[PDB]
Structures are given as structure tokens and as C-alpha cells.
């Protein structure tokens, strides 16, 4: 239903990560990050949707979703940074890179992208201590070189 309303985060992310896209749809990607900051429940819904798309068996779907995540985090909004900086969301990324879960069934391209993003946040947003906690654990388990 919400996917039938072009302005909803659901409809936006379905376009921004559509497996049929021949190339990155920056219009939909930036539109998603923008719509994200319109409502108080926007950020929480965004991470919920992103987490699912990122765990998709269809690589191109997961890759575009990671591009959306990377792009929105690059925006200077505190609310979204804080939502991604919660284990509620970080655990979903851990499941993708961890061999104990989806790691053994996820491409190297996707897993590497997640690790690169996590690292960039540990450097650029040091105040999101939970992100650093998650990253350090991954390096302790041998996930991160």
C-alpha cells in the first residue's frame, strides 16, 4: 500500500534500489535521504527498510541500498546518524558480514562495502560510539583485517 504512494519512504526506496535499474538512480536516492528528514518517525523507518534491502540475496539490490545508506549518512542530519548508530541497525549489518549468519552467503563486494562504510563512520562520526564498538568487535573476530 505505502509503496503505491511515490512520496513514502517505501515507494522511494523501492525505486532507489530496484533490481531493474541499469544504473544508480540518484534522483530517487537523494529523494529518499531528503524525505527521511520530514517526519520524526522518518529515520527509524528508513533504517528498518534499508536493513532489509541490504540483506537481499540479489546483489544489485543490496548494493544500491548500501549506496542509499552511504549517501544519507553523508548528509549532516543528527537524527539519522543516531539511528544508524544504534545496535538495532548495526546488528543487521553485522549479520551480513558475519560468517555465523549471512556472511557465508553474501558476496565479497557487499561485505567489503559494509566494512568500508563502518570504518568511515568510526572516523567521521566518533560520537556514534556504538558504531566503533561494532567495528572493533568485527576486527577482534577476524572479520575486519
Amino acid at each position: 500500500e505505502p509503496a503505491m504512494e511515490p512520496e513514502t519512504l517505501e515507494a522511494r526506496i523501492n525505486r532507489a534500489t530496484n533490481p531493474l535499474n541499469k544504473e544508480l538512480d540518484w534522483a530517487s536516492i537523494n529523494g529518499f535521504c531528503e524525505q527521511l528528514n520530514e517526519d520524526f518517525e522518518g529515520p527509524p523507518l528508513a533504517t528498518r527498510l534499508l536493513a532489509h534491502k541490504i540483506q537481499s540475496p540479489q546483489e544489485w539490490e543490496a548494493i544500491q541500498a548500501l549506496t542509499v545508506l552511504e549517501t544519507c549518512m553523508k548528509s549532516c542530519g543528527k537524527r539519522f546518524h543516531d539511528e544508524v548508530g544504534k545496535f538495532r541497525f548495526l546488528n543487521e549489518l553485522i549479520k551480513v558480514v558475519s560468517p555465523k549468519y549471512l556472511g557465508s552467503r553474501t558476496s565479497e563486494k557487499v561485505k567489503n562495502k559494509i566494512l568500508e562504510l563502518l570504518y568511515s563512520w568510526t572516523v567521521g562520526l566518533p560520537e556514534e560510539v556504538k558504531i566503533a564498538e561494532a567495528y572493533q568487535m568485527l576486527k577482534k573476530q577476524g572479520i575486519v583485517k
Partner: peptide
């Protein structure tokens, strides 16, 4: 709120 880290 939030949950615990997944080990």
C-alpha cells in the same frame, strides 16, 4: 532505547 550488540 536500543538493543544489545550482536556478538
Amino acid at each position: 532505547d536500543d538493543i544489545s550488540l550482536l556478538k
